[PDB]
UniProtKB/Swiss-Prot annotation:
<dbReference type="GO" id="GO:0060856">
    <property type="term" value="P:establishment of blood-brain barrier"/>
</dbReference>
<dbReference type="GO" id="GO:0030301">
    <property type="term" value="P:cholesterol transport"/>
</dbReference>
<dbReference type="GO" id="GO:0044877">
    <property type="term" value="F:protein-containing complex binding"/>
</dbReference>
<comment type="similarity">
    <text>Belongs to the AAA ATPase family.</text>
</comment>
<dbReference type="GO" id="GO:0010971">
    <property type="term" value="P:positive regulation of G2/M transition of mitotic cell cycle"/>
</dbReference>
<dbReference type="GO" id="GO:0001778">
    <property type="term" value="P:plasma membrane repair"/>
</dbReference>
<comment type="function">
    <text>(Microbial infection) In conjunction with the ESCRT machinery also appears to function in topologically equivalent membrane fission events, such as the terminal stages of cytokinesis and enveloped virus budding (lentiviruses).</text>
</comment>
<dbReference type="GO" id="GO:0007080">
    <property type="term" value="P:mitotic metaphase chromosome alignment"/>
</dbReference>
<keyword id="KW-0967">Endosome</keyword>
<dbReference type="GO" id="GO:0031902">
    <property type="term" value="C:late endosome membrane"/>
</dbReference>
<dbReference type="GO" id="GO:0016887">
    <property type="term" value="F:ATP hydrolysis activity"/>
</dbReference>
<dbReference type="GO" id="GO:0016197">
    <property type="term" value="P:endosomal transport"/>
</dbReference>
<dbReference type="GO" id="GO:0030496">
    <property type="term" value="C:midbody"/>
</dbReference>
<dbReference type="GO" id="GO:0043162">
    <property type="term" value="P:ubiquitin-dependent protein catabolic process via the multivesicular body sorting pathway"/>
</dbReference>
<keyword id="KW-0131">Cell cycle</keyword>
<dbReference type="GO" id="GO:0051261">
    <property type="term" value="P:protein depolymerization"/>
</dbReference>
<dbReference type="GO" id="GO:0005886">
    <property type="term" value="C:plasma membrane"/>
</dbReference>
């Protein structure tokens, strides 16, 4: 029910968001590193909110904090209206102090029939009518902040906006989603995709990289002809040959009406994800985030901010 990992995500693992990371470092770590610099009339913000465009992968970011922060335990869940009935939250905080340090984290905090059995129980503990909420932080993640009850919303003292990465991260994000796969791409072609537009998110980018990986396969499943070549037999790197058939265009240097159904498991020379592959997969996609879309957030700052 409640995920309970004690993670490992250095700041560096998080692609970029230093402008936020700084914002986080301030609100949390400093208070931690120099406790003798936070008391008297000022207090650390126990509730902090993570908000920005969808697919910006806020989730992950959370863990990075719980890590770079004394190494607190990550108590986390979601708003699948909590396994679509309540006590979960009670034990949640109960555990919180029970194993502090710790970070209560809720991706999808946004959530009619007033089923405040939970809704209030939250603020109640958030308010910590009695038991100590100190040493424990709570984070919220949402793509739509404007849809939360003033109460809920006024709990997270500090609000940090999670922008969209279009920089080096955007790019280096492709290598990441390319994992350990054969590709003809290079660090030249990787920052290239990076600079090649923006308005794209970790999701977005991921989906393209996803289409760009199968590219090689459909070529092979739906290929017109193949051309025999030389090289170690896929079945044995030691057994060089000259019968490996890779796929080729209709009228080419050595084509023959074929299909994988004829090409031998070992006699097949499989293509790797190329740069056109990459590109093309992109040239057929739109950023799931528009300006109007992103403007709908801007609202918040103006009429809210640190709630007040």
């Amino acid at each position: 029910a409640i995920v309970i990992e004690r993670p490992n995500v250095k700041w560096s693992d998080v692609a970029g968001l230093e402008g936020a990371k700084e914002a986080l470092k301030e609100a949390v770590i400093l208070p931690i590193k120099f406790p003798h610099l936070f008391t008297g009339k000022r207090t650390p913000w126990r509730g902090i909110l993570l908000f920005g465009p969808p697919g910006t992968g806020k989730s992950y970011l959370a863990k990075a904090v719980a890590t770079e922060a004394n190494n607190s335990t990550f108590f986390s869940i979601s708003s699948s209206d909590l396994v679509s009935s309540e006590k979960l939250v009670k034990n949640l905080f109960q555990l919180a102090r029970e194993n502090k340090p710790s970070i209560i984290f809720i991706d999808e905090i946004d959530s009619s029939e007033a089923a405040r059995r939970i809704k209030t129980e939250f603020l109640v503990q958030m308010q910590g009518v009695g038991v100590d909420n100190d040493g424990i932080l709570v984070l919220g993640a949402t793509n739509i902040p404007w849809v939360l009850d003033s109460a809920i919303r006024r709990r997270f003292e500090k609000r940090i906006y999670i922008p969209l990465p279009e920089a080096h991260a955007r790019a280096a994000m492709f290598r990441l989603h390319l994992g350990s796969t054969q590709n003809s791409l290079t660090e030249a072609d990787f920052q290239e995709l990076g600079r090649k537009t923006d308005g794209y998110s970790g999701a977005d980018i991921s989906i393209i990289v996803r289409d760009a990986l199968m590219q090689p396969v459909r070529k092979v499943q739906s290929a017109t002809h193949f051309k025999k070549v030389r090289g170690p037999s896929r079945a044995d790197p030691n057994c060089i040959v000259n019968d490996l058939l890779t796929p080729c265009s209709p009228g080419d240097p050595g084509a023959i009406e074929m299909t994988w159904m004829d090409v031998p498991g070992d006699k097949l020379l499989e293509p790797v994800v190329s740069m056109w592959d990459m590109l093309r997969s992109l040239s057929s996609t739109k950023p799931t985030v528009n300006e109007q879309d992103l403007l709908k957030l801007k609202k918040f700052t103006e009429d809210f901010g640190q709630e007040g």
